């Protein structure tokens, strides 16, 4: 009978809610009431990268924190040199509807995907010297939303058919599949030790996955609308999400509940991207009002504004050593802030 | 030593990007949208994953995309098509049961935040079936739309066919002109299953849209 199963499911949901309520005793805001404010964080544009014809959806930094890759809707991948603004490479793509890009940890490969439902891997260091397609990973049903390189051989991708997958680039078959989401999976974030990852969906839900065991461990709720971005804390025991209700929230894996929310009355536009600084003290979030705000993670008080873009901010990333932050936008211009 | 090689590579990439810029600015992009019942596939085949179609009229290149490999929920991937010249909307006017679904989809597209600057070209397809159904006087329209009982025409078979055609067109135009910022319009056309003027109609409508954009840009509007 379906009715008894539904009653049992809601009974377990009530039990989980009661356990979470009992496990909470204090709030993070009151614990951090005795620390000093960060102050006014003023950042200036140090570089402006020009050359993209159309709007930008994705970018990714390199491990050396010098070269980065950006994807655009005219159908081009460009590898930059943020020190001198020289275009190292320019890769023309087969499909112009590209929604994501990735940079290999070893720096030999890049990947991209979009409405074509196919993820393609490019070899930047071929023996001849040119850039050619190395593999085309097919098997997803919806559009590709995000992809991340575990290492030179394994890549994890999320699609719009409410599933994630783990690929083997050498052979091209799906090693593992992750299921359980109800809406489109919009973003994923790998753990610092690359043993777990999270994923946000259009169901206002986030889940924690085990790469080896291949099952969902925990599920976190609290948002009221679709989730657009997600990012791990530097120590690997927390993450932050950005949604369409114009709020961000910080979740803790061990406590298995929300810790703090970052919102203001004057903001009515959703968040398109989030990121953390090197030490985790500052949280940077992009908004639909053409601005990016800098938050105080331990205080939930705004501390800075970046106002250099004339259109929607789509992507935002911070280098490994935290020397700079790069933000792309829908007006086809990248900017390095410091 | 490496600076000279880096500069030479940058210059080569800039030249290639300039050529690509010229080629990209040359052409125009369109989005073909509709339902399964509507004969949009037949339309795109008449002037013939994502089904691209390139046609050229008066030495001007047009590009049309018909995405069909996705799921039912389209509120997230629809934001990739906010820079197109126009949206082609195809409606099967002979099916009264699913006309309100078309009206709701049109309202959702018209009132979107990122699609509030894109003009829509409306095609009211399947005219012969509508004429046959109206003449055969078996399935009535008044019971689906009770407002049809107090409507007067503002075709050759009878005035009733004209009345029905313009009633449906007026429904769509009322939704269009209800809420608007005078930044985008709607161009309704009456097309049948077999016609050869769709390319010319698209050319004229796109020319009007572009001219209006240029007038606004040059402060004349």
């Amino acid at each position, epitope marked *: 009978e379906l009715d008894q199963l539904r009653q049992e499911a809601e009974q377990l949901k009530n039990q989980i809610r009661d356990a979470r309520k009992a496990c909470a005793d204090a709030t993070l805001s009151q614990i951090t009431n005795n620390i000093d404010p960060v102050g006014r964080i003023q950042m200036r544009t140090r570089r402006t990268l020009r050359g993209h014809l159309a709007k930008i959806y994705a970018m990714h930094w390199g491990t050396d924190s010098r070269l980065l890759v950006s994807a655009s809707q005219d159908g081009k991948l460009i590898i930059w040199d943020s020190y001198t603004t020289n275009k190292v490479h320019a890769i023309p793509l087969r499909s112009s509807w590209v929604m994501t890009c990735a940079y290999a940890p070893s720096g030999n490969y890049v990947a991209c995907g979009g409405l074509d439902n196919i993820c393609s891997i490019y070899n930047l260091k071929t023996r001849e010297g040119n850039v050619r397609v190395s593999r085309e990973l097919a098997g997803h049903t919806g559009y590709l939303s995000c992809c991340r390189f575990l290492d030179d051989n394994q890549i994890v991708t999320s699609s719009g058919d409410t599933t994630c997958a783990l690929w083997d680039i050498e052979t091209g078959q799906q090693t593992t599949t992750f299921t359980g989401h109800t*809406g489109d999976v919009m973003s994923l974030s790998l753990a610092p030790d690359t043993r777990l990852f999270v994923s946000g969906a259009c169901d206002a839900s986030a889940k924690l996955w085990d790469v080896r065991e291949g099952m969902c461990r925990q599920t976190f709720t609290g948002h009221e609308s679709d989730i657009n971005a997600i990012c791990f804390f530097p120590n690997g025991n927390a993450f932050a999400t950005g949604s*369409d209700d114009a709020t961000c929230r910080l979740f803790d894996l061990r406590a298995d509940q929300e810790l703090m929310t970052y919102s203001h009355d004057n903001i009515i536009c959703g968040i398109t991207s989030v990121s953390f600084s090197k030490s985790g003290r500052l949280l940077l979030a992009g908004y639909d009002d053409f601005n990016c705000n800098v938050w105080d993670a331990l205080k939930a008080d705004r501390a800075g504004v970046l106002a250099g873009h004339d259109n929607r901010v789509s992507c935002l990333g911070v280098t490994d050593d935290g020397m700079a932050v790069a933000t792309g936008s829908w007006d086809s211009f990248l900017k390095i802030w410091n | 030593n490496e600076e000279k090689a880096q500069r030479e590579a940058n210059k080569k990439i800039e030249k290639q990007l300039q050529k690509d810029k010229q080629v990209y600015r040359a052409t125009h992009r369109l989005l073909l949208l509709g339902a399964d019942n509507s004969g949009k596939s037949t339309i795109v085949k008449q002037m013939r994953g994502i089904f691209e179609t390139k046609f050229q009229v008066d030495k001007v290149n047009f590009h049309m995309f018909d995405v069909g490999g996705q799921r*039912d929920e389209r509120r997230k991937w629809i934001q990739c098509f906010n820079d197109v010249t126009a949206i082609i909307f195809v409606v099967d006017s002979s099916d009264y049961n699913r006309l309100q679904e078309a009206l709701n989809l049109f309202k959702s*597209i018209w009132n979107n935040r990122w699609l509030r600057t894109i003009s829509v070209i409306l095609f009211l397809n399947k005219q012969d079936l509508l004429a046959e159904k109206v003449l055969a006087g078996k399935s009535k329209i008044e019971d689906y*739309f009770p407002e049809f009982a107090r409507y007067t025409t503002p075709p050759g078979e009878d005035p009733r066919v004209t009345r029905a055609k313009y009633f449906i067109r007026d429904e769509f135009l009322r939704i269009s002109t209800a809420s608007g910022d005078g930044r985008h319009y709607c161009y309704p056309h009456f097309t049948c299953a077999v016609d050869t003027e769709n390319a010319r109609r698209i050319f004229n409508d796109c020319r009007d849209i572009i001219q209006r954009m240029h007038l606004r840009q040059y402060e004349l509007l």
Partner: nanobody
Amino acid sequence: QVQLQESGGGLVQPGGSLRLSCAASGFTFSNYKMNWVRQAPGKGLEWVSDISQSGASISYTGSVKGRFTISRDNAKNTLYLQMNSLKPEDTAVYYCARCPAPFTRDCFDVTSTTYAYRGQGTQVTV
């Protein structure tokens, strides 16, 4: 999480009356546009009515005009549908849908097969 529970179904003779109520929780009710959706047996999801954020604008489908009335109570976070002069073609399961995003006036995908912010449904038979 978003929770929408509907109640009010039952057996009604033709020409009778019936009232449907939906209790909403887990989100701010006053920032969202609410819908009523029904699904007849052997037929897909069909839109019925919607009401604005404050109830200023009300619209219905063609076949229910003059018989159905939709209202919302922001004070207690409830939605209502007042059925009148029921017909044998009105038998279906009634779902209450929600606008995906706040402060907007467009509603994508409320009638989809796997919409997330939709209720379990109640059975109405005449």
